Design a binder for this molecule. Structure first.
Ligand SMILES: CCCCCCCC/C=C/CCCCCCCC(=O)N[C@@H](COP(=O)(O)OCC[N+](C)(C)C)[C@H](O)/C=C/CCCCCCCCCCCCC
Ligand SMILES: CCCCCCCC/C=C\CCCCCCCC(=O)N[C@@H](COP(=O)(O)OCC[N+](C)(C)C)[C@H](O)/C=C/CCCCCCCCCCCCC
Ligand SMILES: CCCCCCCC/C=C\CCCCCCCC(=O)N[C@@H](COP(=O)(O)OCC[N+](C)(C)C)[C@H](O)/C=C/CCCCCCCCCCCCC
Ligand SMILES: CCCCCCCC/C=C\CCCCCCCC(=O)N[C@@H](COP(=O)(O)OCC[N+](C)(C)C)[C@H](O)/C=C/CCCCCCCCCCCCC
Ligand SMILES: CCCCCCCC/C=C\CCCCCCCC(=O)N[C@@H](COP(=O)(O)OCC[N+](C)(C)C)[C@H](O)/C=C/CCCCCCCCCCCCC
Ligand SMILES: CCCCCCCC/C=C\CCCCCCCC(=O)N[C@@H](COP(=O)(O)OCC[N+](C)(C)C)[C@H](O)/C=C/CCCCCCCCCCCCC
Ligand SMILES: CCCCCCCC/C=C\CCCCCCCC(=O)N[C@@H](COP(=O)(O)OCC[N+](C)(C)C)[C@H](O)/C=C/CCCCCCCCCCCCC
Ligand SMILES: CCCCCCCC/C=C\CCCCCCCC(=O)N[C@@H](COP(=O)(O)OCC[N+](C)(C)C)[C@H](O)/C=C/CCCCCCCCCCCCC
Ligand SMILES: CCCCCCCC/C=C\CCCCCCCC(=O)N[C@@H](COP(=O)(O)OCC[N+](C)(C)C)[C@H](O)/C=C/CCCCCCCCCCCCC
Ligand SMILES: CCCCCCCC/C=C\CCCCCCCC(=O)N[C@@H](COP(=O)(O)OCC[N+](C)(C)C)[C@H](O)/C=C/CCCCCCCCCCCCC
Ligand SMILES: CCCCCCCC/C=C\CCCCCCCC(=O)N[C@@H](COP(=O)(O)OCC[N+](C)(C)C)[C@H](O)/C=C/CCCCCCCCCCCCC
Ligand SMILES: CC(C)CCC[C@@H](C)[C@H]1CC[C@H]2[C@@H]3CC=C4C[C@@H](O)CC[C@]4(C)[C@H]3CC[C@]12C
Ligand SMILES: CC(C)CCC[C@@H](C)[C@H]1CC[C@H]2[C@@H]3CC=C4C[C@@H](O)CC[C@]4(C)[C@H]3CC[C@]12C
Lengths: 135, 446, 135, 446, 135, 135
């Protein structure tokens, strides 16, 4: 159902490029901004480079009148050192549960990642803003 | 003796000389780290008489000051003009530190207040050479010989060091008008939001402090329920016990020298040597409404730049004139990378400031970051912002000098760039400062 | 219902204070960060000063199981200009109607307000970041 | 020595000279930033005797003044005539601040009140040259020589600078009538709405202040629950202690000079040089009921214009006579564009004024707005409006001078134009001023 | 009814002050700016002084689902001249009638009063701006 | 319904001309000043210029007896730089809803716009005055 949705904003607050890779929604569908009807394939985002000081928005939502949430994953990867992982993000906004999941796993000491705005109690997963910076 | 006035003291050579000696009227005031303390060496030649007026109106006066490092000057009962003249030296020689109780942010304002209960006897005046009258004060031959020796040294650095030692020994300013008598002083400082009515706050603080001195308690509560810490000074106890109670005018010691030597001394005391160089457009940053320029090529060895500017013509490089030495505030400070979630630099020394935000990643170990520097708080004056850009995410400020009628307060128009919204968090405070023109020496063969 | 929720993050990007006023939750309830059970009173935010570079979070949501959604209002006013109104914000995440609503009104010209992150199609209203600045 | 009057003091050369010295009777007053402080250089030759009368009646005398910058003059017990004579110098040399508690808006009025508890011994009179009697006071040869040297300089600017230095050293006015004895003074200021009965307010404040001094407390509550801040001054302690308690007459120092030199000194002291030029009608503004005229052609370099006028014949251009220097109030001020939602200008320096609203878009960077200037507060006097038009959105005031009988207060009939309702918001306060005719020097070769 | 409303903006463009007196809403209710629910008392304006260049808003509107319009009176008087009457204003936005009404009376010849913006044909009475200027 | 009405007063407080473009009333009609029966075509306001210190009044209202409010839009445009857009104004006073919409969109720092007098609570949208200043 469209009641299960998530917006992931990647904001590069540093001065180095960061890449998005392996973006995949196992449940639900990626869609356009402010338009849950305009489905978009993962190819629109996979391999893209956010570039410093600009934001890239990923919109995911459940299938309409479905009883299905939205579950997906993607890796933020550093291209400056042979495409090495920065972090691995996993989001789950299920239709048949209250506990949403937002896991940022992985390790890279050369990068600092903050995130805010998520809601894990009940309902939708909210608009999560993720500030990335290479130090 | 009863009924004796300053005229009777001045008429008698013994009493006049005792008044001169006990008040240090022949000595300059060193505006050092400990405050305005008089020098131990006589500056001028002992006059054969003094110009004086008689005044016996006892009353309570109050003064307020907004400058930051003028606490000690206020505690010495310097009027506004004297504080203005003496502020550069105090600041330069002051001891900077974080956690300073003074606040001068864009939201709140701090000020010093002083109430003097005066029992005056008169006022003594001296004649400066600039006045042009026949009774000018004559500098002691020792001071003139010292200045000549300082200016005769082989190298500019040695000349500057000699002048610095000479002015540390003989003082920085000379009191040309001083009031005699007794005084009970109470001083305090108050910080308040800029939104509050300034007149009401000033009136409340004045009323509280005047009541405190009149009733003469280390803490005072005003009508507005403001808690004030008050420092009390006693200078009242017969013509033998008269002391200086107020300084109405001071003249910089350098100004007392003859013009040909005065010019050289003034030029040699300028902290920084300046230079104009070509500029280059910073690659990238096409999102910003205006282009960013940095000094082109490699900075000459020993020279430093002050930050990114919007001017497309030239950039200002500066070089210190005095070598770094313990106990002396450097003219410039290195910058270090921020603690976290920011690429902006931070001033290494407590109260220094840089003029522009860094457009990029600052690394103090590599150029052009290694040659970026801040300025001593006496080198800069508040500027004004000109806004560019249509959105917060990309808007910038260009720092323009505040136009003033007096050339003494002119500031360089470097068009420093300040990012309106710095990405990340924990960024340094936004700079809004412009460099003073009087602090830079140009075209010198140095 | 907790399924309907909103987070409002006021970020004073400028260099002068901005004050909240007239905060009022006409429906649902405010609550503390990350806990919809810990209800809070509007007085916890009314009249608060958001110092420059400071962030202030307001979390609202429906009731624990009621068919109500959430709805509220507040104003941003300039403390340095006699509390002159900067903007008036209205938020509504209904339980019955699918479409949400986030409206910013006002005409103060010496202020710049930029809000982003809202969802208007279906589900919770989401997280809304409101950057405020005084020219 | 019991029951000695001023006659005993005067008849004794020792006591007479002690009275003259202790009271600075041979020195002028320098209306400076610090108030009316006497000069330290004798202005007149020491007389052989003093003319005096004896008066031993002790009472309380209350006085009120409505001029703006006459607080210090009131604190010195200057009667109405003395304050009137001294006001120009204090106003010119005063320190300006936008946070002044004194208010003289169109709706609010402010006034200083002073109560003196007097212990008089007599009055001393000096004979000025204009009186025409045989015992006139003779200027000291030093002052006359200084004036001659100042007037002998090569360039008008140098002459004016020399005269300014001379009058800063020797004083601006000379006290011709003084009261000897002791005094206790209490001074305050009150602000009230013009709608209130002025007589009742005056009587209430006078009663409160007289009760304060009579019972001699920094705050006094009157019968109308008015909280007044009171400043107290003690000048009382045997003939050895008598001091000047009141000033009944002061004559401008420049007025003591001989006529051929007095004329030159007066002319050279005028702040501005004036000139009449042709005008051109501003394009547009056909809605307004009257035409708007501005200076025609390019403004000659160094000159300035004052504002838009309804006069179709000529416009007045003014040029400062004294170069700008620190510590000296410029005759004119530059204007800057308003903060927002207004096209009108704002005075750069506090307390200054300009005569007309700008009928267009003001931009100080380009002409004709670059050469538009304000005026120092001492240059202007309130005018009277004449409204033209029959709608709030198109009516305009013409500021005609207030007719006076004495030429000393005549003002220029420039017919400055003010706009009744300025579109937008945040506009500056509307001007209601006219330029004094005595501040402008015409026909000079300069 | 809330559909009947009026906003009277007093704008003192002159120099001397102008005072409000005898404010009275014979029908309907006053309220705060932008909020018809927040009822306000006439004492909040009675005897108030509109300083030169200042603006003062008076909002009136019918009661919630009442079938009542909003009617009222007030007077502008000159404080500097013994509270002499400058003008007397009567406003009426009826519910049961289509024709509204806004009438200003008085014969004070040292004041200029200009009002605009009222709607009289049908519906609410609209926003009325009054400019006052003492000659 | 004539009940749904709006008056837009463009007031050029600056010194430079401003232009009106793309005026279109999707619902309702444009009528003469104070006479809802006198219909006026949008051509009489398309491309007009408001010289500095001028006032231009646009009166819009619904059809006489119809469940149809009035909705419309226009653009304030700068003729000094090739008719560059200054602002986009949209108004909607609906018959079937109790909330009225008045939105000013677009952005260019060369102009300052200050609008006031709207009513979004209920009834007609009211009279709106818009001061424009080229600065
Ligand atoms: C044949 C047998 C029939 C009878 C069996 C009963 C069936 C009911 C089912 C069992 C669920 C019971 C949920 C109760 C949640 C309590 C928490 C809560 O919802 N409480 C308030 C406030 O919650 P709040 O959001 O303010 O948070 C603060 C509270 N907190 C706890 C979080 C601290 C909140 O408004 C109120 C929400 C309304 C919920 C009531 C729904 C029950 C309807 C009864 C129908 C009876 C029909 C009978 C016909 C025959
Ligand atoms: C004659 C035989 C009858 C019995 C057979 C039927 C058995 C029904 C079983 C199961 C259905 C339910 C699946 C789960 C819903 C998944 C879609 C969804 O969860 N739907 C949400 C909203 O979906 P969404 O907003 O995302 O839609 C997109 C938005 N858009 C605007 C674009 C459309 C919307 O709240 C959810 C409402 C569902 C409430 C459940 C009530 C149960 C119905 C019992 C009917 C019994 C009839 C008996 C008569 C004799
Ligand atoms: C006496 C007779 C009474 C019974 C009559 C009741 C008829 C039901 C009425 C109408 C319900 C409306 C259904 C939802 C619309 C489909 C839209 C949609 O949700 N379809 C995909 C979403 O695909 P997607 O979201 O990606 O894009 C969509 C395309 N779009 C371009 C629009 C975006 C999505 O998975 C598919 C969901 C499964 C379909 C649910 C069907 C439930 C109906 C069971 C009726 C049983 C009656 C028999 C009882 C005896
Ligand atoms: C006459 C004919 C006889 C009819 C017999 C009735 C058979 C009913 C149909 C078959 C069951 C269908 C369930 C499987 C749906 C497949 C989608 C899915 O699989 N839905 C999950 C996925 O959603 P999820 O939230 O978990 O996504 C998060 C992803 N993650 C990986 C993290 C889990 C989600 O949970 C769970 C959804 C459960 C909704 C089912 C409600 C139906 C109630 C029936 C009432 C009976 C009435 C009888 C009237 C005659
Ligand atoms: C023959 C008799 C038929 C008539 C029976 C009368 C009932 C009429 C219908 C029911 C009331 C109408 C719903 C209003 C309240 C729902 C509020 C809400 O929206 N409820 C959300 C949860 O709210 P929330 O997430 O905030 O709580 C979480 C809090 N927690 C802390 C625990 C996480 C939760 O998903 C939503 C669930 C959907 C509820 C509809 C279920 C339909 C029932 C069909 C079966 C009827 C019996 C059949 C017998 C043969
Ligand atoms: C023998 C049995 C006879 C009796 C049977 C039925 C009795 C019903 C009793 C009780 C009344 C119920 C009202 C309660 C209001 C709650 C507060 C509110 O008011 N709930 C709003 C929230 O509105 P919203 O969330 O959208 O936003 C807020 C508003 N805002 C302005 C901000 C948008 C929202 O509409 C309301 C929606 C609720 C509709 C549920 C309908 C299904 C349940 C009835 C099915 C019965 C079947 C029975 C078969 C045997
Ligand atoms: C056999 C016995 C039967 C007796 C029949 C009794 C019927 C009496 C007749 C009628 C008079 C009663 C109407 C008085 C209106 C006054 C209130 C008002 O005019 N109301 C507005 C204003 O509403 P408002 O917006 O201002 O409220 C604030 C909005 N807010 C959201 C904040 C609440 C609201 O809009 C919209 C009003 C339109 C209402 C249409 C007319 C009523 C329909 C009657 C149907 C009768 C069918 C008869 C079947 C038998
Ligand atoms: C058997 C079938 C029976 C059907 C039942 C019908 C019940 C009606 C339903 C619903 C009405 C909805 C009103 C809600 C008002 C809101 C408060 C308000 O309108 N109150 C005042 C103004 O108060 P105020 O202006 O101060 O605003 C309030 C401020 N607040 C902060 C609180 C919002 C205002 O005049 C009041 C006007 C009265 C209008 C209602 C009249 C109802 C007549 C029914 C007669 C039925 C007889 C027959 C019964 C058998
Ligand atoms: C068998 C059972 C049948 C029961 C039938 C009993 C009906 C109840 C009787 C009658 C109530 C009368 C309300 C009292 C006025 C309300 C307050 C007021 O005062 N209403 C004025 C406000 O008007 P306004 O706003 O313009 O005033 C501002 C300007 N002014 C200068 C004038 C002050 C306005 O005019 C008056 C309008 C008239 C109201 C029309 C609605 C009546 C509906 C009749 C339904 C008949 C159904 C018959 C079924 C058989
Ligand atoms: C068996 C026969 C049944 C016949 C069916 C009739 C049912 C009606 C249903 C359909 C609703 C019609 C909505 C259309 C809105 C018109 C536009 C408008 O909203 N109109 C406003 C004001 O419009 P306006 O101000 O512009 O007019 C002024 C213009 N002028 C230039 C002249 C000044 C005006 O108040 C609002 C009035 C409220 C509507 C009145 C409803 C009458 C109820 C009759 C009940 C009869 C039951 C009989 C049972 C025995
Ligand atoms: C034997 C009986 C035979 C006769 C029965 C036929 C029933 C009539 C069929 C068809 C009605 C279709 C309406 C036609 C106008 C639609 C234009 C429109 O579309 N009207 C929107 C505009 O409203 P809005 O102002 O908000 O839009 C502009 C703003 N926007 C932002 C949206 C652009 C607004 O909602 C709509 C409101 C409609 C008024 C309600 C009328 C009630 C109808 C029941 C009559 C009952 C009679 C009883 C007899 C016994
Ligand atoms: C006994 C039966 C046949 C009587 C039927 C009377 C019907 C036709 C009457 C009763 C109320 C009337 C409505 C009352 C008010 C209005 C609002 C007006 O703006 C348009 C006409 C309209 C919508 C009327 C249409 C005709 C109407 C519906
Ligand atoms: C056959 C008998 C019962 C008479 C039926 C008359 C019906 C069809 C009449 C009565 C009232 C009428 C409505 C009155 C007013 C309006 C508003 C207008 O903007 C569109 C038409 C609309 C919505 C009318 C449609 C037709 C209508 C519903």
């Amino acid at each position: 159902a469209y009641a299960q949705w998530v917006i992931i904003i990647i904001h590069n607050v540093g001065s180095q490029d960061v890449k998005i890779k392996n973006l995949k929604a196992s449940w639900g569908k990626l869609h356009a901004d402010g338009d849950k009807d305009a489905e978009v394939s993962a190819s629109n985002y996979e391999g893209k480079i956010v570039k410093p000081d600009e934001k890239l928005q990923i919109n995911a939502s459940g299938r309409s009148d479905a009883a299905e949430g939205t579950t997906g994953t993607f890796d933020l990867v550093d291209p400056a050192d042979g495409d090495k992982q920065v972090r691995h993000f996993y989001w789950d906004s299920p239709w048949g549960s209250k506990t949403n999941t937002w896991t940022v796993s992985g390790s890279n000491t050369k990068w600092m990642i903050e995130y805010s705005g998520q809601n894990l109690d009940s309902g939708a997963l909210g608009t999560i803003t993720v500030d990335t910076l290479k130090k | 003796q009863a009924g004796d006035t300053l005229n009777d003291v001045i008429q008698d050579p013994t009493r006049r000389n005792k008044l001169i000696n006990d008040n240090n009227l022949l000595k300059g005031i060193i505006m050092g780290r400990d405050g305005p303390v008089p020098s131990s060496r006589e500056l001028i030649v002992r006059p054969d008489t003094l110009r004086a007026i008689i005044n016996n109106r006892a009353t309570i006066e109050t003064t307020t000051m907004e400058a930051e490092f003028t606490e000690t000057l206020m505690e010495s009962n310097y009027n506004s003009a004297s504080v203005k003249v003496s502020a550069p030296f105090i600041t330069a020689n002051s001891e900077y530190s974080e956690s300073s109780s003074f606040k001068n942010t864009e939201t709140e304002k701090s000020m010093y207040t002083s109430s003097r209960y005066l029992f005056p006897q008169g006022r003594i005046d001296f004649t400066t050479p600039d006045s042009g009258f026949d009774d000018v004060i004559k500098l002691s031959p020792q001071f003139t010989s010292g200045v000549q020796a300082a200016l005769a040294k082989a190298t500019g650095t040695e000349k500057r060091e000699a002048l610095q030692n000479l002015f540390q020994e003989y003082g920085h300013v000379f009191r040309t008008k001083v009031h005699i008598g007794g005084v009970l002083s109470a001083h305090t400082m108050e910080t308040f939001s800029r939104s509050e009515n300034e007149t009401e706050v000033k009136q409340d603080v004045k009323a509280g402090l005047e009541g405190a001195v009149k009733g003469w308690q280390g803490t005072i509560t005003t009508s507005q329920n403001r808690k004030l810490n008050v420092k009390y000074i006693v200078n009242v106890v017969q013509s033998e016990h008269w002391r200086v109670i107020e300084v109405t005018e001071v003249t910089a010691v350098a100004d007392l020298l003859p013009q040909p030597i005065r010019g050289q001394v003034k030029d040699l005391l300028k902290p920084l040597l300046g230079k104009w160089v070509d500029v280059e457009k910073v690659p990238g940053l096409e999102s910003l409404p205006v282009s960013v320029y940095r000094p082109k090529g490699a900075i000459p060895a020993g020279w430093f730049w002050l930050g990114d500017t919007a001017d497309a013509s030239k950039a200002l490089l500066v070089k210190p004139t005095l070598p770094a030495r313990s106990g002396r505030n450097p003219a410039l400070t290195s910058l270090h990378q921020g603690s976290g979630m920011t690429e902006q630099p931070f001033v290494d020394l407590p109260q220094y400031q840089y003029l522009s935000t860094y457009f990029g990643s600052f690394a103090h170990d590599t150029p052009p970051g290694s040659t970026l520097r801040g300025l001593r708080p006496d080198h800069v004056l508040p500027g004004r912002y000109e806004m560019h850009g249509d959105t917060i995410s990309t808007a910038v400020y260009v720092t323009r000098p505040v136009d003033v009628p007096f050339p003494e307060d002119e500031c360089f128009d470097l068009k420093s760039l300040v990012r309106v919204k710095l990405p990340g968090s924990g960024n340094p405070p936004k700079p809004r400062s412009a460099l003073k023109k009087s602090m830079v020496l140009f075209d010198s063969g140095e």
